[model samples]
Target: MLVSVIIPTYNRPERLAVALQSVQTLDFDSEQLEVIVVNDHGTPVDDVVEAAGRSLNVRLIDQPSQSGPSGARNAGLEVARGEYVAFLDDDDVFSPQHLSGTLPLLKGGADFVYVNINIARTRVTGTTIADAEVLVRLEFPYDRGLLDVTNHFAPSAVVCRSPRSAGAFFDTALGVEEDWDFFLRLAHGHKYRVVHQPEVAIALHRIPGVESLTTPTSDDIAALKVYEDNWHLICERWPAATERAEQVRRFMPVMYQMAYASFEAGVPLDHHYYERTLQVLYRALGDPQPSPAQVEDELRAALEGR
Candidate 1:
């Protein structure tokens, strides 16, 4: 079966070459693979396109607007002609057997298939360190709530039947968590097959001067809103997973207190975070009398570093 590998990239032309090269090295027949790289912003570099064209089946689509990765992916989906689709980030490299190993399982009736991945930390000094494997072949659930913890469904490891399982496209409004939202929707009524074998090696580049996971930017806040907005749909779709609701309930207070403290720490507040948190808390606290003292204690303790 033909498989379409869709890669969405921004300004990382150099990294894009590496990703495209990895896809070209797959064990599958060249005719069975179609590479679609959507340029999210900036003009497509001639060198990147030439490198991609060297592969038997690689096409570059230029997207003038900066709609982020989700938008770029959606654009690729519009033109993709393969029966199965997989996503790979521009900056990360995939294993040579990513498609060849996962396609048979997907063809054999699995709506979604994902495998384990090795994490590599890329440094500027031409040194790379392989962090331990992230998910070691754990059984993932078909249910949305349990599936939320399925870290195995990273972009590189995912393979899905294109037409049969395609649901809502990725949310461009969300800079991050768009993939999470898309997965939740696709896995709604479908069972997922987790391949314990390692299929991909995802490299996480540690770039200097770029924000290094210290704090959330304005874009992060927007992405969090997208996550919160769709969370109710997630909970409602899997009512049998009550633990999920309780978990969200129990954990929200701490999140709120942290948000409050972050505000005091001179970190900008995103009204969407607090607004959505309150909505979830209200739903979670249904039928139980709201206790002001308990809420106060938790909030105070969280801020006081207890």
Candidate 2:
């Protein structure tokens, strides 16, 4: 197989089937491509293999209970046989040009490559592509410094030279920032380039049980825990990344202010979000841990401008 497409799914089997159907729409050497579906926790795995047929290689495999999407992806990698591997979220789709467009980049001597994607919030009635009114496309060269602030590429938008580029694996310890951690390692050691055109269209659907970087809603604040938990690993791995640490530190206050602004505007902040806000700010402040009410009052005063 020239390329192995690894799709890791949790309980999102219906979306998984949809994505598999889209794969057949791509124009490429079907015989040389393999699709490995790593079931994270869903069922009816046998039927998923039949979704995409004789034109290409599609196989569904299951493993022991896994923790994160990264774990499921790793599970797929363990069984992958292609020279290179690409990733697709169960909730997203591939353009007809995806394989024809991206495989050349890898064949062109890049160990890894990523393209821009349009990301948007969910639209329940119609398809995600049409519903992607807010999905924005990203463009940037390989800049380690800027990477400290955010992930420029989504896993679905990336294709990597397999086994050769396999040195880096997602950090399972992290809740959802595992992709960021994985990309950090790739940018740290390997040579990579970007495809000029946006070949992938990502659906930003937020259905529960579907795992992506931007899930559990902004109000949940569960994703915020990743920043605190994964900071040490990031620092330990990249000692020169003080800027990245600063980026993480800046995240909390800015978000707290946003929450404050929303509250001042009469939008209720999630109760847990308030809890996370004060907890994160506690270290940045002094004496006893401040109450959420105190934090809110200060944020209210701080945002006051003439």
Tell me which residue pairs clash in candidate 2.
119-135
The lDDT of each candidate is: 0.59, 0.62
Candidate 1 per-residue lDDT, tens place, 135-228, comes to: 2222333333434432224666678878333544776775655676567666554444433334434443423344433554656555545555
lDDT of 1 at 40: 83
* Pairs in clash, predicted candidate 1: none
**Model 1 local distance difference test score:** 0.59
Name the 10 consecutive residues with the lowest summed lDDT in model 1. Answer: 120-129
Q: Candidate 2, residues 1-306: lDDT per residue as tens digits?
A: 798999888887788777777677777778788999888766666666675665668888786776678788888777788888888888877766777777777888777777656554543221336555542345444433445444455788778877334566776776666777777777664434434445544443433233333333554343444554575566456443544435444554566447545644555443334323333443334345456566555545333320
- Model 1 stretches with alpha carbons more than 4 Å out: 123-145, 149-152, 163-167, 189-201, 204-306
